[PDB]
Protein backbone atom coordinates (compact mmCIF):
# COMPACT_ATOMS: atom_id res chain seq x y z
CA UNK A 1 0.00 0.00 0.00
CA UNK A 2 1.13 3.57 -0.58
CA UNK A 3 2.77 4.94 2.57
CA UNK A 4 3.86 8.48 3.33
CA UNK A 5 7.34 9.06 4.67
CA UNK A 6 5.73 10.11 7.94
CA UNK A 7 3.73 6.87 8.04
CA UNK A 8 6.84 4.78 7.39
CA UNK A 9 8.65 6.75 10.09
CA UNK A 10 5.88 6.17 12.64
CA UNK A 11 5.75 2.44 11.91
CA UNK A 12 9.54 2.07 12.02
CA UNK A 13 9.59 4.01 15.30
CA UNK A 14 7.09 1.63 16.86
CA UNK A 15 9.04 -1.35 15.53
CA UNK A 16 12.44 -0.19 16.78
CA UNK A 17 11.00 0.80 20.16
CA UNK A 18 9.42 -2.64 20.51
CA UNK A 19 12.61 -4.48 19.54
CA UNK A 20 14.90 -2.46 21.80
CA UNK A 21 12.45 -2.66 24.71
CA UNK A 22 12.16 -6.44 24.34
CA UNK A 23 15.95 -6.78 24.30
CA UNK A 24 16.32 -4.52 27.34
CA UNK A 25 13.54 -6.33 29.20
CA UNK A 26 14.75 -9.89 28.71
CA UNK A 27 18.45 -9.11 29.19
CA UNK A 28 18.22 -6.69 32.15
CA UNK A 29 14.75 -6.40 33.69
CA UNK A 30 14.09 -10.14 33.95
CA UNK A 31 17.21 -11.00 36.02
CA UNK A 32 16.56 -8.03 38.29
CA UNK A 33 12.95 -9.07 38.84
CA UNK A 34 13.93 -12.71 39.38
CA UNK A 35 16.26 -11.80 42.23
CA UNK A 36 13.83 -9.21 43.59
CA UNK A 37 10.98 -11.71 43.85
CA UNK A 38 13.42 -14.30 45.20
CA UNK A 39 14.52 -12.07 48.07
CA UNK A 40 10.90 -11.02 48.61
CA UNK A 41 9.78 -14.61 49.18
CA UNK A 42 12.87 -15.05 51.36
CA UNK A 43 11.53 -12.11 53.41
CA UNK A 44 10.26 -13.12 56.84
CA UNK A 45 6.76 -11.70 56.30
CA UNK A 46 6.07 -14.04 53.38
CA UNK A 47 7.46 -16.98 55.41
CA UNK A 48 5.13 -16.61 58.41
CA UNK A 49 4.90 -20.06 59.98
CA UNK A 50 2.16 -19.75 62.62
CA UNK A 51 -0.97 -18.70 60.74
CA UNK A 52 -2.64 -17.50 63.95
CA UNK A 53 -0.13 -14.65 63.77
CA UNK A 54 -2.01 -13.56 60.64
CA UNK A 55 -5.57 -13.71 62.01
CA UNK A 56 -6.78 -10.29 63.13
CA UNK A 57 -9.49 -9.34 65.62
CA UNK A 58 -13.10 -9.06 64.52
CA UNK A 59 -14.92 -7.09 67.21
CA UNK A 60 -18.33 -8.67 66.68
CA UNK A 61 -20.22 -8.76 70.01
CA UNK A 62 -20.77 -12.41 70.79
CA UNK A 63 -24.49 -12.90 71.58
CA UNK A 64 -25.18 -13.84 75.18
CA UNK A 65 -27.87 -16.54 75.47
CA UNK A 66 -31.20 -15.02 76.51
CA UNK A 67 -25.31 -3.80 70.96
CA UNK A 68 -23.58 -2.93 67.69
CA UNK A 69 -20.40 -3.77 65.81
CA UNK A 70 -17.61 -1.23 65.73
CA UNK A 71 -15.53 -0.52 62.66
CA UNK A 72 -14.07 -3.83 61.49
CA UNK A 73 -10.61 -3.32 59.94
CA UNK A 74 -9.03 -5.29 57.17
CA UNK A 75 -6.14 -7.56 58.01
CA UNK A 76 -3.07 -5.33 58.13
CA UNK A 77 -0.66 -8.16 57.30
CA UNK A 78 -2.62 -9.36 54.27
CA UNK A 79 -3.22 -5.88 52.87
CA UNK A 80 0.46 -4.97 53.25
CA UNK A 81 1.49 -8.17 51.47
CA UNK A 82 -1.09 -7.36 48.78
CA UNK A 83 0.36 -3.86 48.41
CA UNK A 84 3.69 -5.56 47.75
CA UNK A 85 2.29 -8.14 45.33
CA UNK A 86 -0.02 -6.05 43.13
CA UNK A 87 2.72 -4.01 41.37
CA UNK A 88 4.51 -7.24 40.51
CA UNK A 89 1.53 -9.01 38.95
CA UNK A 90 0.51 -5.97 36.91
CA UNK A 91 4.13 -5.48 35.83
CA UNK A 92 4.38 -9.10 34.71
CA UNK A 93 1.18 -8.78 32.68
CA UNK A 94 2.57 -5.66 30.98
CA UNK A 95 5.84 -7.39 30.12
CA UNK A 96 4.08 -10.49 28.80
CA UNK A 97 2.05 -8.21 26.52
CA UNK A 98 5.32 -6.69 25.29
CA UNK A 99 6.79 -10.13 24.59
CA UNK A 100 3.62 -11.19 22.75
CA UNK A 101 3.77 -8.14 20.51
CA UNK A 102 7.49 -8.57 19.88
CA UNK A 103 7.08 -12.17 18.75
CA UNK A 104 4.00 -11.34 16.68
CA UNK A 105 5.80 -8.57 14.82
CA UNK A 106 8.61 -11.06 14.26
CA UNK A 107 6.15 -13.53 12.69
CA UNK A 108 7.02 -13.53 8.96
CA UNK A 109 4.89 -13.58 5.83
CA UNK A 110 2.70 -16.67 5.61
CA UNK A 111 4.35 -19.30 3.44
CA UNK A 112 3.88 -22.91 2.43
CA UNK A 113 7.05 -24.36 3.94
CA UNK A 114 10.05 -23.66 6.12
CA UNK A 115 7.34 -23.24 8.76
CA UNK A 116 9.39 -24.80 11.55
CA UNK A 117 10.64 -21.40 12.70
CA UNK A 118 7.14 -19.96 12.78
CA UNK A 119 6.10 -23.14 14.60
CA UNK A 120 8.67 -22.31 17.28
CA UNK A 121 7.29 -18.77 17.39
CA UNK A 122 3.79 -20.19 17.80
CA UNK A 123 4.90 -22.50 20.62
CA UNK A 124 6.55 -19.71 22.60
CA UNK A 125 3.43 -17.64 21.92
CA UNK A 126 1.34 -20.46 23.37
CA UNK A 127 3.46 -20.40 26.52
CA UNK A 128 3.36 -16.62 26.95
CA UNK A 129 -0.42 -16.59 26.43
CA UNK A 130 -0.72 -19.30 29.08
CA UNK A 131 1.17 -17.24 31.66
CA UNK A 132 -0.93 -14.23 30.59
CA UNK A 133 -4.10 -16.13 31.51
CA UNK A 134 -2.50 -17.20 34.79
CA UNK A 135 -1.62 -13.65 35.81
CA UNK A 136 -5.14 -12.53 34.88
CA UNK A 137 -6.38 -15.22 37.28
CA UNK A 138 -4.12 -13.74 39.97
CA UNK A 139 -5.50 -10.27 39.20
CA UNK A 140 -9.12 -11.36 39.61
CA UNK A 141 -8.57 -13.41 42.77
CA UNK A 142 -6.96 -10.45 44.56
CA UNK A 143 -10.27 -8.58 44.12
CA UNK A 144 -12.23 -11.72 45.01
CA UNK A 145 -10.44 -11.69 48.37
CA UNK A 146 -11.71 -8.23 49.31
CA UNK A 147 -15.25 -8.82 48.08
CA UNK A 148 -15.51 -12.19 49.84
CA UNK A 149 -14.06 -10.95 53.13
CA UNK A 150 -16.38 -7.94 53.14
CA UNK A 151 -19.38 -10.18 52.54
CA UNK A 152 -18.18 -12.54 55.27
CA UNK A 153 -17.79 -9.85 57.93
CA UNK A 154 -21.16 -8.38 56.96
CA UNK A 155 -22.73 -11.81 57.43
CA UNK A 156 -20.98 -12.28 60.78
CA UNK A 157 -22.20 -8.92 62.07
CA UNK A 158 -25.73 -9.54 60.79
CA UNK A 159 -25.94 -13.04 62.34
CA UNK A 160 -23.89 -12.82 65.53
CA UNK A 161 -25.06 -16.22 66.78
CA UNK A 162 -23.42 -17.95 63.81
CA UNK A 163 -19.72 -18.35 64.63
CA UNK A 164 -18.99 -20.18 61.36
CA UNK A 165 -18.95 -16.81 59.58
CA UNK A 166 -16.25 -15.62 61.99
CA UNK A 167 -14.24 -18.77 61.37
CA UNK A 168 -14.80 -18.14 57.66
CA UNK A 169 -13.36 -14.63 57.90
CA UNK A 170 -10.24 -15.99 59.58
CA UNK A 171 -10.04 -18.77 56.98
CA UNK A 172 -10.32 -16.29 54.12
CA UNK A 173 -7.37 -14.38 55.56
CA UNK A 174 -5.27 -17.54 55.94
CA UNK A 175 -6.11 -18.84 52.46
CA UNK A 176 -5.29 -15.39 51.09
CA UNK A 177 -1.83 -15.50 52.67
CA UNK A 178 -1.18 -18.96 51.23
CA UNK A 179 -2.37 -17.83 47.80
CA UNK A 180 -0.13 -14.76 47.95
CA UNK A 181 3.05 -16.68 48.73
CA UNK A 182 2.22 -19.18 45.98
CA UNK A 183 1.57 -16.14 43.77
CA UNK A 184 4.98 -14.53 44.25
CA UNK A 185 6.57 -17.93 43.69
CA UNK A 186 4.62 -18.29 40.44
CA UNK A 187 5.49 -14.75 39.32
CA UNK A 188 9.20 -15.45 39.76
CA UNK A 189 8.78 -18.78 37.97
CA UNK A 190 6.98 -17.11 35.05
CA UNK A 191 9.72 -14.50 34.68
CA UNK A 192 12.33 -17.27 34.68
CA UNK A 193 10.42 -19.47 32.22
CA UNK A 194 10.03 -16.52 29.85
CA UNK A 195 13.76 -15.89 30.04
CA UNK A 196 14.63 -19.55 29.49
CA UNK A 197 12.36 -20.20 26.52
CA UNK A 198 13.14 -16.91 24.77
CA UNK A 199 16.90 -17.19 25.32
CA UNK A 200 16.95 -20.81 24.15
CA UNK A 201 14.93 -20.22 20.96
CA UNK A 202 15.93 -16.61 20.19
CA UNK A 203 17.62 -17.51 16.90
CA UNK A 204 14.50 -19.00 15.33
CA UNK A 205 12.30 -16.40 17.05
CA UNK A 206 14.17 -13.42 15.59
CA UNK A 207 14.90 -15.14 12.24
CA UNK A 208 12.26 -17.84 11.66
CA UNK A 209 12.57 -18.42 7.92
CA UNK A 210 16.37 -18.31 8.15
CA UNK A 211 19.24 -17.14 6.01
CA UNK A 212 18.73 -16.65 2.29
CA UNK A 213 18.98 -19.78 0.16
CA UNK A 214 21.34 -20.27 -2.80
CA UNK A 215 18.32 -19.40 -4.99
CA UNK A 216 18.02 -22.33 -7.38
CA UNK A 217 15.32 -20.06 -8.79
Amino acid sequence: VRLSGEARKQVEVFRQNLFQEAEEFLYRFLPQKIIYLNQLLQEDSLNVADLTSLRAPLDIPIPDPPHKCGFLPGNEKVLSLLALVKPEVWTLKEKCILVITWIQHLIPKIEDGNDFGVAIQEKVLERVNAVKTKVEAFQTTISKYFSERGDAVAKASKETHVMDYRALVHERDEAAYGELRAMVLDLRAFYAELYHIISSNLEKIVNPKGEEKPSMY
Binding site: D112, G113, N114, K213, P214, M216
Partner: protein, 235 residues
Amino acid sequence: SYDRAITVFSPDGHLFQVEYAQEAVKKGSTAVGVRGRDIVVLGVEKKSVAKLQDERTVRKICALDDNVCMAFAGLTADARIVINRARVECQSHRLTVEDPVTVEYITRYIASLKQRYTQSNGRRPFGISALIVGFDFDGTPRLYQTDPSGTYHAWKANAIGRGAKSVREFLEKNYTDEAIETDDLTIKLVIKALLEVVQSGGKNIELAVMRRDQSLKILNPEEIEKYVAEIEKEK
Protein backbone atom coordinates in the same frame (compact mmCIF):
# COMPACT_ATOMS: atom_id res chain seq x y z
CA SER B 1 2.11 -30.88 3.98
CA TYR B 2 4.26 -30.32 0.89
CA ASP B 3 7.70 -30.85 2.51
CA ARG B 4 7.71 -34.67 2.83
CA ALA B 5 8.49 -35.66 -0.79
CA ILE B 6 11.04 -34.27 -3.21
CA THR B 7 8.80 -34.75 -6.24
CA VAL B 8 5.76 -32.84 -5.00
CA PHE B 9 5.65 -29.13 -5.72
CA SER B 10 4.12 -26.85 -3.15
CA PRO B 11 1.50 -24.22 -3.79
CA ASP B 12 3.56 -21.32 -5.15
CA GLY B 13 5.85 -23.99 -6.64
CA HIS B 14 8.50 -24.48 -3.96
CA LEU B 15 10.35 -27.79 -3.76
CA PHE B 16 11.17 -27.81 -0.07
CA GLN B 17 13.28 -30.94 0.50
CA VAL B 18 16.03 -29.51 -1.70
CA GLU B 19 15.79 -26.31 0.35
CA TYR B 20 16.20 -28.44 3.48
CA ALA B 21 19.32 -30.01 1.98
CA GLN B 22 20.64 -26.52 1.20
CA GLU B 23 19.97 -25.76 4.87
CA ALA B 24 21.87 -28.91 5.84
CA VAL B 25 24.85 -27.50 3.97
CA LYS B 26 24.81 -24.47 6.28
CA LYS B 27 25.51 -26.68 9.31
CA GLY B 28 28.86 -27.75 7.89
CA SER B 29 32.28 -26.28 8.47
CA THR B 30 33.14 -23.13 6.58
CA ALA B 31 35.04 -23.15 3.30
CA VAL B 32 36.27 -20.21 1.25
CA GLY B 33 37.63 -19.81 -2.25
CA VAL B 34 39.31 -16.94 -4.03
CA ARG B 35 40.72 -16.51 -7.53
CA GLY B 36 44.14 -14.94 -7.71
CA ARG B 37 45.57 -13.90 -11.04
CA ASP B 38 47.94 -16.90 -11.06
CA ILE B 39 46.69 -18.79 -7.97
CA VAL B 40 43.43 -20.27 -6.77
CA VAL B 41 43.34 -20.69 -3.00
CA LEU B 42 40.90 -22.95 -1.19
CA GLY B 43 40.59 -22.66 2.57
CA VAL B 44 38.56 -24.76 4.98
CA GLU B 45 38.13 -24.54 8.72
CA LYS B 46 38.98 -27.47 10.99
CA LYS B 47 36.42 -28.36 13.65
CA SER B 48 38.71 -29.72 16.38
CA VAL B 49 41.48 -32.25 16.95
CA ALA B 50 39.86 -33.97 19.99
CA LYS B 51 43.43 -34.91 21.08
CA LEU B 52 42.95 -38.66 20.41
CA GLN B 53 42.22 -38.32 16.69
CA ASP B 54 44.49 -38.51 13.65
CA GLU B 55 44.18 -35.41 11.48
CA ARG B 56 45.22 -37.13 8.23
CA THR B 57 41.99 -39.13 7.96
CA VAL B 58 39.84 -35.97 7.92
CA ARG B 59 40.61 -33.71 4.95
CA LYS B 60 37.95 -31.47 3.44
CA ILE B 61 40.11 -30.37 0.51
CA CYS B 62 40.71 -33.04 -2.12
CA ALA B 63 42.18 -33.31 -5.61
CA LEU B 64 39.87 -34.70 -8.26
CA ASP B 65 42.76 -34.73 -10.74
CA ASP B 66 46.08 -33.05 -11.45
CA ASN B 67 44.42 -29.79 -12.56
CA VAL B 68 41.22 -29.77 -10.43
CA CYS B 69 40.48 -29.82 -6.70
CA MET B 70 37.41 -29.33 -4.54
CA ALA B 71 36.39 -28.46 -1.01
CA PHE B 72 33.00 -29.23 0.47
CA ALA B 73 30.66 -28.15 3.22
CA GLY B 74 27.97 -30.62 4.12
CA LEU B 75 27.55 -34.30 4.76
CA THR B 76 31.00 -35.86 4.84
CA ALA B 77 30.03 -39.29 3.53
CA ASP B 78 28.07 -37.76 0.65
CA ALA B 79 31.09 -35.60 -0.10
CA ARG B 80 33.29 -38.70 -0.20
CA ILE B 81 30.95 -40.43 -2.65
CA VAL B 82 30.74 -37.36 -4.89
CA ILE B 83 34.52 -36.91 -4.83
CA ASN B 84 35.10 -40.52 -5.87
CA ARG B 85 32.50 -40.32 -8.64
CA ALA B 86 34.01 -37.10 -9.99
CA ARG B 87 37.49 -38.64 -9.88
CA VAL B 88 36.43 -41.66 -11.92
CA GLU B 89 34.65 -39.33 -14.33
CA CYS B 90 37.84 -37.30 -14.67
CA GLN B 91 39.89 -40.33 -15.58
CA SER B 92 37.11 -41.58 -17.87
CA HIS B 93 36.97 -38.24 -19.70
CA ARG B 94 40.73 -38.36 -20.19
CA LEU B 95 40.27 -41.91 -21.48
CA THR B 96 37.49 -40.91 -23.87
CA VAL B 97 38.80 -37.65 -25.39
CA GLU B 98 42.57 -37.83 -24.66
CA ASP B 99 42.48 -34.44 -22.93
CA PRO B 100 42.43 -33.18 -19.33
CA VAL B 101 39.12 -32.20 -17.78
CA THR B 102 38.03 -28.59 -17.69
CA VAL B 103 36.80 -27.17 -14.39
CA GLU B 104 33.42 -26.33 -15.88
CA TYR B 105 33.12 -29.87 -17.24
CA ILE B 106 33.72 -31.48 -13.85
CA THR B 107 31.45 -29.04 -12.01
CA ARG B 108 28.79 -29.77 -14.64
CA TYR B 109 29.16 -33.49 -13.99
CA ILE B 110 28.95 -33.12 -10.21
CA ALA B 111 25.92 -30.85 -10.60
CA SER B 112 24.29 -33.36 -12.94
CA LEU B 113 24.81 -36.11 -10.37
CA LYS B 114 23.28 -34.01 -7.59
CA GLN B 115 20.42 -33.10 -9.93
CA ARG B 116 19.86 -36.76 -10.74
CA TYR B 117 19.46 -37.51 -7.05
CA THR B 118 17.03 -34.61 -6.55
CA GLN B 119 14.66 -35.38 -9.42
CA SER B 120 13.55 -38.84 -8.26
CA ASN B 121 11.96 -39.85 -4.99
CA GLY B 122 13.44 -42.85 -3.26
CA ARG B 123 16.77 -41.00 -3.28
CA ARG B 124 17.76 -38.06 -1.10
CA PRO B 125 19.79 -35.09 -2.38
CA PHE B 126 23.48 -35.04 -1.66
CA GLY B 127 23.69 -32.78 1.35
CA ILE B 128 26.79 -30.97 0.16
CA SER B 129 27.86 -27.82 -1.58
CA ALA B 130 31.29 -27.74 -3.15
CA LEU B 131 33.92 -25.25 -4.24
CA ILE B 132 35.78 -26.53 -7.29
CA VAL B 133 39.03 -24.85 -8.32
CA GLY B 134 41.28 -25.50 -11.29
CA PHE B 135 43.29 -23.98 -14.09
CA ASP B 136 42.01 -24.45 -17.62
CA PHE B 137 44.10 -25.06 -20.74
CA ASP B 138 44.40 -21.32 -21.42
CA GLY B 139 45.65 -20.97 -17.84
CA THR B 140 42.83 -18.78 -16.59
CA PRO B 141 41.89 -19.42 -12.95
CA ARG B 142 38.45 -20.90 -12.44
CA LEU B 143 36.28 -21.09 -9.35
CA TYR B 144 32.86 -22.72 -9.39
CA GLN B 145 30.30 -23.55 -6.73
CA THR B 146 27.67 -26.28 -6.58
CA ASP B 147 24.76 -26.92 -4.26
CA PRO B 148 22.34 -29.79 -3.54
CA SER B 149 19.84 -28.34 -6.01
CA GLY B 150 22.18 -28.93 -8.96
CA THR B 151 22.77 -25.37 -10.15
CA TYR B 152 26.38 -24.32 -10.64
CA HIS B 153 27.80 -20.82 -10.87
CA ALA B 154 31.23 -19.33 -11.34
CA TRP B 155 32.39 -17.04 -8.55
CA LYS B 156 35.34 -14.69 -8.41
CA ALA B 157 35.38 -15.63 -4.74
CA ASN B 158 32.88 -17.28 -2.44
CA ALA B 159 32.31 -19.19 0.77
CA ILE B 160 30.10 -22.10 1.77
CA GLY B 161 29.03 -23.60 5.06
CA ARG B 162 28.41 -21.99 8.41
CA GLY B 163 29.19 -18.30 8.61
CA ALA B 164 29.19 -18.12 4.82
CA LYS B 165 27.01 -14.99 4.92
CA SER B 166 29.36 -13.11 7.26
CA VAL B 167 32.58 -14.16 5.55
CA ARG B 168 31.18 -13.41 2.08
CA GLU B 169 30.12 -9.95 3.24
CA PHE B 170 33.68 -9.46 4.48
CA LEU B 171 34.98 -10.75 1.16
CA GLU B 172 32.69 -8.48 -0.85
CA LYS B 173 34.22 -5.63 1.12
CA ASN B 174 37.85 -6.75 0.98
CA TYR B 175 38.24 -8.38 -2.45
CA THR B 176 39.73 -6.27 -5.23
CA ASP B 177 42.23 -6.46 -8.06
CA GLU B 178 44.88 -5.18 -5.62
CA ALA B 179 44.50 -8.15 -3.26
CA ILE B 180 44.73 -10.68 -6.10
CA GLU B 181 48.00 -9.10 -7.32
CA THR B 182 50.18 -11.24 -5.01
CA ASP B 183 49.91 -14.96 -4.34
CA ASP B 184 50.79 -14.30 -0.70
CA LEU B 185 48.12 -11.60 -0.70
CA THR B 186 45.52 -14.07 -1.97
CA ILE B 187 46.48 -16.58 0.73
CA LYS B 188 46.39 -13.82 3.36
CA LEU B 189 42.98 -12.65 2.14
CA VAL B 190 41.44 -16.10 2.48
CA ILE B 191 43.14 -16.55 5.86
CA LYS B 192 41.74 -13.24 7.13
CA ALA B 193 38.31 -14.19 5.80
CA LEU B 194 38.35 -17.51 7.66
CA LEU B 195 39.68 -15.64 10.70
CA GLU B 196 36.50 -13.56 10.51
CA VAL B 197 34.61 -16.72 11.53
CA VAL B 198 36.74 -19.20 13.48
CA GLN B 199 37.62 -19.77 17.13
CA SER B 200 41.41 -19.70 16.66
CA GLY B 201 43.55 -18.82 13.69
CA GLY B 202 46.32 -21.28 12.91
CA LYS B 203 44.98 -24.39 14.62
CA ASN B 204 41.53 -24.37 13.02
CA ILE B 205 42.20 -23.61 9.32
CA GLU B 206 43.40 -26.07 6.69
CA LEU B 207 44.44 -24.25 3.52
CA ALA B 208 45.69 -25.24 0.09
CA VAL B 209 46.84 -23.60 -3.13
CA MET B 210 46.96 -24.58 -6.78
CA ARG B 211 49.46 -22.82 -9.01
CA ARG B 212 49.37 -22.50 -12.78
CA ASP B 213 50.94 -25.87 -13.67
CA GLN B 214 51.67 -27.49 -10.29
CA SER B 215 49.79 -30.06 -8.25
CA LEU B 216 47.78 -29.19 -5.17
CA LYS B 217 49.84 -28.17 -2.15
CA ILE B 218 48.33 -28.27 1.32
CA LEU B 219 50.24 -25.56 3.14
CA ASN B 220 52.16 -26.78 6.14
CA PRO B 221 50.95 -25.74 9.61
CA GLU B 222 54.20 -23.82 10.03
CA GLU B 223 53.53 -21.94 6.79
CA ILE B 224 49.98 -21.16 7.91
CA GLU B 225 51.40 -20.00 11.25
CA LYS B 226 53.81 -17.69 9.44
CA TYR B 227 51.03 -16.26 7.28
CA VAL B 228 48.68 -15.62 10.21
CA ALA B 229 51.60 -14.06 12.08
CA GLU B 230 52.18 -11.71 9.14
CA ILE B 231 48.43 -10.98 9.05
CA GLU B 232 48.28 -10.51 12.83
CA LYS B 233 51.29 -8.18 12.90
CA GLU B 234 50.00 -5.82 10.20
CA LYS B 235 46.85 -5.02 12.21
